[PDB]
Design an enzyme around this catalytic site. Sequence first.
Site, mmCIF file in Angstrom:
data_model
loop_
_atom_site.group_PDB
_atom_site.id
_atom_site.type_symbol
_atom_site.label_atom_id
_atom_site.label_comp_id
_atom_site.label_asym_id
_atom_site.label_seq_id
_atom_site.Cartn_x
_atom_site.Cartn_y
_atom_site.Cartn_z
ATOM 1 N N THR D 1 147.252 -34.218 1.818
ATOM 2 C CA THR D 1 145.962 -34.783 2.184
ATOM 3 C C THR D 1 144.908 -33.887 1.543
ATOM 4 O O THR D 1 145.150 -32.712 1.297
ATOM 5 C CB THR D 1 145.967 -34.923 3.721
ATOM 6 O OG1 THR D 1 145.792 -36.148 4.303
ATOM 7 C CG2 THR D 1 145.243 -34.672 4.399
ATOM 8 N N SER D 2 143.777 -34.480 1.183
ATOM 9 C CA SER D 2 142.625 -33.777 0.634
ATOM 10 C C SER D 2 141.370 -34.245 1.330
ATOM 11 O O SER D 2 141.065 -35.441 1.319
ATOM 12 C CB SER D 2 142.432 -33.994 -0.868
ATOM 13 O OG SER D 2 143.039 -33.265 -1.810
ATOM 14 N N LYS D 33 140.469 -41.382 7.328
ATOM 15 C CA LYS D 33 140.485 -40.036 7.836
ATOM 16 C C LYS D 33 139.130 -39.641 8.356
ATOM 17 O O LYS D 33 138.985 -38.572 8.952
ATOM 18 C CB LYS D 33 140.843 -39.097 6.706
ATOM 19 C CG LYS D 33 142.078 -39.421 5.908
ATOM 20 C CD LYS D 33 143.210 -39.366 6.824
ATOM 21 C CE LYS D 33 144.428 -38.741 6.742
ATOM 22 N NZ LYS D 33 145.133 -37.799 6.448
ATOM 23 N N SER D 129 146.098 -30.087 1.927
ATOM 24 C CA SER D 129 147.211 -29.538 1.180
ATOM 25 C C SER D 129 147.027 -29.832 -0.278
ATOM 26 O O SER D 129 147.631 -29.164 -1.111
ATOM 27 C CB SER D 129 148.555 -30.128 1.585
ATOM 28 O OG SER D 129 148.711 -31.244 2.400
#
Lengths: 149, 71, 88, 196, 249, 242, 217, 241, 86
Positions: D1-2, D33, D129
């Site tokens: 995920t960013s 998100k 991550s």
Amino acid sequence: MSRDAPIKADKDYSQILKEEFPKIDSLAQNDCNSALDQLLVLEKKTRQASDLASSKEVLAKIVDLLASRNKWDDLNEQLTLLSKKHGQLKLSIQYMIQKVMEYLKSSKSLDLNTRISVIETIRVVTENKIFVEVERARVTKDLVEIKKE
Amino acid sequence: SKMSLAPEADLDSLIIRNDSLSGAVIAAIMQEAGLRAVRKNRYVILQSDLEEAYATQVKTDNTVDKFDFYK
Amino acid sequence: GEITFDGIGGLTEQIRELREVIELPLKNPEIFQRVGIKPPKGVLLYGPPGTGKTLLAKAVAATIGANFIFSPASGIVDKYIGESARII
Amino acid sequence: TSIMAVTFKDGVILGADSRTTTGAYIANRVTDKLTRVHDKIWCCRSGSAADTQAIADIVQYHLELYTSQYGTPSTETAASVFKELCYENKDNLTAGIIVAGYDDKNKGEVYTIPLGGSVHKLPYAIAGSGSTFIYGYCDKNFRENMSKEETVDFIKHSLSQAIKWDGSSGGVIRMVVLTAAGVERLIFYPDEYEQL
Amino acid sequence: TDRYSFSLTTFSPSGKLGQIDYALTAVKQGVTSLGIKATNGVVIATEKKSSSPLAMSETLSKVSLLTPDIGAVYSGMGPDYRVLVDKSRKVAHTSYKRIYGEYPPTKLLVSEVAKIMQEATQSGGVRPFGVSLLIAGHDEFNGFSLYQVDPSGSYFPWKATAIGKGSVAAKTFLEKRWNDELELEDAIHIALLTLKESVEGEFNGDTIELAIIGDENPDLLGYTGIPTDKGPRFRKLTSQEINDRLEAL
Amino acid sequence: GYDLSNSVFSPDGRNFQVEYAVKAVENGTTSIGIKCNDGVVFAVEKLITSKLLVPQKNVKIQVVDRHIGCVYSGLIPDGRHLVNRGREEAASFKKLYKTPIPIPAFADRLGQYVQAHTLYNSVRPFGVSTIFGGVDKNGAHLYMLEPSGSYWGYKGAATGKGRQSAKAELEKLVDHHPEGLSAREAVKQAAKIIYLAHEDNKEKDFELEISWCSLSETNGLHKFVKGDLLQEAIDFAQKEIN
Amino acid sequence: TSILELGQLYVTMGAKDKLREFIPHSTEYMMQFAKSKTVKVLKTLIEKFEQVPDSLDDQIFVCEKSIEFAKREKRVFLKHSLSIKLATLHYQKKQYKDSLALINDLLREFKKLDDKPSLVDVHLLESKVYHKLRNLAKSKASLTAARTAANSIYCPTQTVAELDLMSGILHCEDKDYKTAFSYFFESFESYHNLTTHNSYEKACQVLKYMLLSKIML
Amino acid sequence: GYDRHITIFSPEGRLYQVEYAFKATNQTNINSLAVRGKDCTVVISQKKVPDKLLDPTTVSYIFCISRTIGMVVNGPIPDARNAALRAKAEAAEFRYKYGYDMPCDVLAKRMANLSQIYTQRAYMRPLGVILTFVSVDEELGPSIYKTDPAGYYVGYKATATGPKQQEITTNLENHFKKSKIDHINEESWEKVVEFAITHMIDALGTEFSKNDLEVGVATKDKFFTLSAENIEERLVAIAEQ
Amino acid sequence: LPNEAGRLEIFKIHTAKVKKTGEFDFEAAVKMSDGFNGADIRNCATEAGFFAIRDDRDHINPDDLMKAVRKVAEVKKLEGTIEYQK
Ligand SMILES: Nc1ncnc2c1ncn2[C@@H]1O[C@H](COP(=O)(O)OP(=O)(O)OP(=O)(O)O)[C@@H](O)[C@H]1O
Ligand SMILES: [Mg+2]
């Protein structure tokens, strides 16, 4: 309510524009509507005493509208707008209503004008009876003499 | 019948609003409505005169429907 | 102990309310004929002492100028039962 | 995920991906998100999904009562609630939250909250991550107080690189813009940024 | 401290518990309500009254659903019914829909709610809810049944009953009008007629609230395609429907 | 009847016991609070009942968080207990939200507590009025909290015996300044109306204590006005009533 | 549906020989069903037949036949409702002997069965029968009974109007037009505001009686 | 006999304690008037500014429970804040645990149940505030539910509160006689405020200032209050009609 | 009991019943020394004539009066006047 600045300010300005009353009055001939707006602000204040003091300035100015035989149509409108707005409680306008009637007498204005303006005064004071009554009977008595003829 | 009225006053939507009334207190309501009419300088009883009068001198009890959730 | 029409200040609103019952049918009972009600009779005054319930009475005796009476508190209470009734 | 947020002159722009991997199977790829915990303070999730979501509900609950009794929350005020809940559960819950909001006093602001429960004010934050891969690009091309248009492209370019180097990040790039102009959602399909 | 744990119910010296006599008085200050059990349904009826004429009585409920086939109606205080009906719903679900996975029998539910009343006469900081409820229902084990719940915390099965301040009048009316076999249609006509003599308001379907636990409805069940499963036995009648039945008296 | 507790209630819509407790505050020391443009200047009469006392060592002024002064009148222990409760509340807010507690927020929390003891019979109603306020990011504020659990915003407030002298002159103060006065100016005006309110306490003699929280003098922190500046105000007030 | 739309056929229609014949055998069609929802229709059926005139014999004859089947296997409510109609039919047909006999018979049994607001009606009929027999002693006595019974709150606007109507008419015969006049005003309003379906006719009659009172005075 | 001192029934079938709660809301003298518009619900209420030393902006009787639900409170201001706090707490709870903002109908019922529990405790005295909840929901449209210190609520076309509220009821009732519908049709929220003020002026026979009023307006999916300048515009428009 | 400014209306009529060097500064002070009834307005007048007698004056000065209204108020804190009226 919790501020007393409006009381102070209406008295200051009424003083200032009662010494600028000759400057206003001369502008009145150039644009009576420009002159009138100076004074209107004063009566949008919440102090009925200082509104009464400045309603004197208006009554003086509206001699010019009365004297003319086409500007008194706007006088009739102003009375209607002032009374409904707030009344500036109900004290200020009592003295105003009273003082138009005396003017109509000395000007010698036509039967037709006298009729219609006074007809606007009684339309408005109809349901009111806060002190209009006192004026109101004499005001109708002026119509009566005309209506006999 | 005794007093004059305007036909704007209702007599019959005032029965439900208070049930614990004696008749002398209905003689009070109407007599006070003829006092309130006279502060107007009116000689016919209006529903402004009659309902303003109705509200006072009828006090608030523990039996009345002013407080009600017992239904 | 007489005083002017407005002789209790602030309770002026109560003087106006008093004269509705008292002085308006007094001069003319006839304006109430049109209305059709029982003539207005009876007033109770109550308050915390010192507000001139009585001072008002002295004003409405003076101003109207009608026949006035007045009663001591307990000096119209006798020693004979029903003799204190006869007096009143 | 960013996930990231970056400050800019008129406010703060938020950027996220919508891919969520459980294992190698992406549980959902359209999943937003960007979370509303207040009308003008939104947040970004990373880490274990449940744990961040759970806290965000608790913060929305607590900031509702805050707004109705104690005045509004600032970006700071919100960030501390996240911090203090992560602090009691720094041995049990792991959450990555980036908290971004626009106040009109101090302007757009970014606070970030690591897995342990700490808060740090930054002009830009990156977490997840996939955002470990884009750290050097982010610091170097970041300009403070850029235009709205330049900030949008800025985050787009960083996250295209994030998606290039992270398999846990992908899907569309979602953005929320918190400003005085309002709350403007933007969305970017993958063809649009695989070129940009 | 807070040493209120002593009961506020106490025996009276000529017998009888003083507190529940007082609560029974509160039932006779409340509205009127009745239940007639038919052999092919139950009808329950009550009168609606409002605190203002500006209050809507289309958003006013005095007949409430406990479970789909089982309805309740009160006489007494509004406030006291309002919390207690929620507790009636709650105990049907905690103790028979989390244990027996279905909606409880009418007999069973009525017993459980009397336990709730019974602990509101025990201990301080409580006092009994001053209502009597009629719990009309249908279960698949005891048939139709009609019950009256007391603020005592006792229950009795009935064939037709009334509660409220006009209860004595209503049950004497119903004395001649009840038969061994009844139609649901006739039951409705008796119900509105009995309540005409006990209502001092309008007698329009606007102000008369009518509900039947008559025959079940599988189009209000909310799904279809299990024939086996049955829908609400309850059906509240809206105001226009109640007017049709007023003309059919 | 109708005072035996506070779950009694009268057909008058009053609670009697609670009105009675306001009379304890009427027996307290005079205390004032002036809401200024940029802050608040509190002042409190500290009686000298004996020359045995130690001056400016018995504070009636306890600070809460760092920027909220609290000063009171009435029953001194009960108000110190009230302020102890609210210091715990201030800390909790700072814990959770990592910011000092606002003035409207601090008022709400105190108000619930005092409001709670006029419903329970297990806990006794308050007998304090507290005057408290300060400067946070939402402005200067001034609040007066009744023992009944009421508060409002104020342009001027007072409580104690000598509130009769104090309250009147605050009507003239608003009338002086219908847009308020400087924090600097309010030092000498908070002192001045304790000295005029020393005419309801002219049996005894007194010591002036002054404290402030204002943006422009202390930076929105509550500090004590001490030294030469406290003494400058005392010299000013002293001349007015003479 | 079938019996409801057959009475629409009947009501249409006009006073016809077929209509007359149809109705005492429409109670045979009514019993054919064996259903207990006959009760609701059987009252309206008869009400329709009364409304237009259909010959002296037949309207009493039909109503009499129904009453037999309203005690055959049906409710006491149905029976008593039809007796109220039978009694009114006899009064119009100008049998006061058959009207009075029936009235005395009704009212006494339903004091064992008293729960009835339907005896209020029976009292008002009783007053009218006595008035036309020209005894006002017992017209007053029954009328007094009817006023008392309607003091209890269950009474329709129609029911209160009927009471006002006879009370007014009694007092005129007592040679007092003050108390008669007071009832004719409230009676009049009841008929004026109750929608016209037979009410236009009675409203006209009441207005005349209001006016009569003021001529005497 | 203590049936006026603790919350037990009398032989009149009434709780006196509970009745006394209604007799406190008339002592602070706050009147409110609430009408349902066509896209809004408007509630105007008195603001008593007694002194020059009260700041009128912090004088409140309108508490904003949720994002969309204002609450106006009639009766003592201590009990008002305790009620406002409770109402807010439960609404946030409802959003938290059920995942959407609390409806007005259900909020009225939740506070009604706790007020009834406060008339069931003999050591917790009920709160003596009558609470009006105004909203526009998208599940019930414009709504008013008024709860009371007993635990009773009902829906309202319009409602009033205070000592002189009987006078208000008359005016409103006439207005709904003419329209023959249970809400005012007027698509501008501003002119529904103007109508509301007209009915208040008739009832109380007093003309108002901007600081004698405090106005809350619930429009579709937001609740806000008018500031004092904005209220004056509405009172200027009364004359324009 | 006289209102906050019903005390004031008596203050303007009873100050014409006394001599003064000039006093038109009632309004704030009497409002905030409330507690009075209508009889206590004339005891504030008499008490201003006792502070006068100390100073040796035959006038009411507002320096005399505003110590008076403070003193009349305090002695009246002696007992309430609590009444509940219909
Ligand atoms: N309202 C007032 N204004 C001026 N003087 C007053 C007023 N009230 C009382 N006084 C002074 O007090 C004197 C005595 O008071 P008074 O007997 O008029 O009072 P009251 O209200 O009728 O009391 P109570 O209820 O005890 O009879 C008056 O004659 C007057 O001198
Ligand atoms: Mg006296």
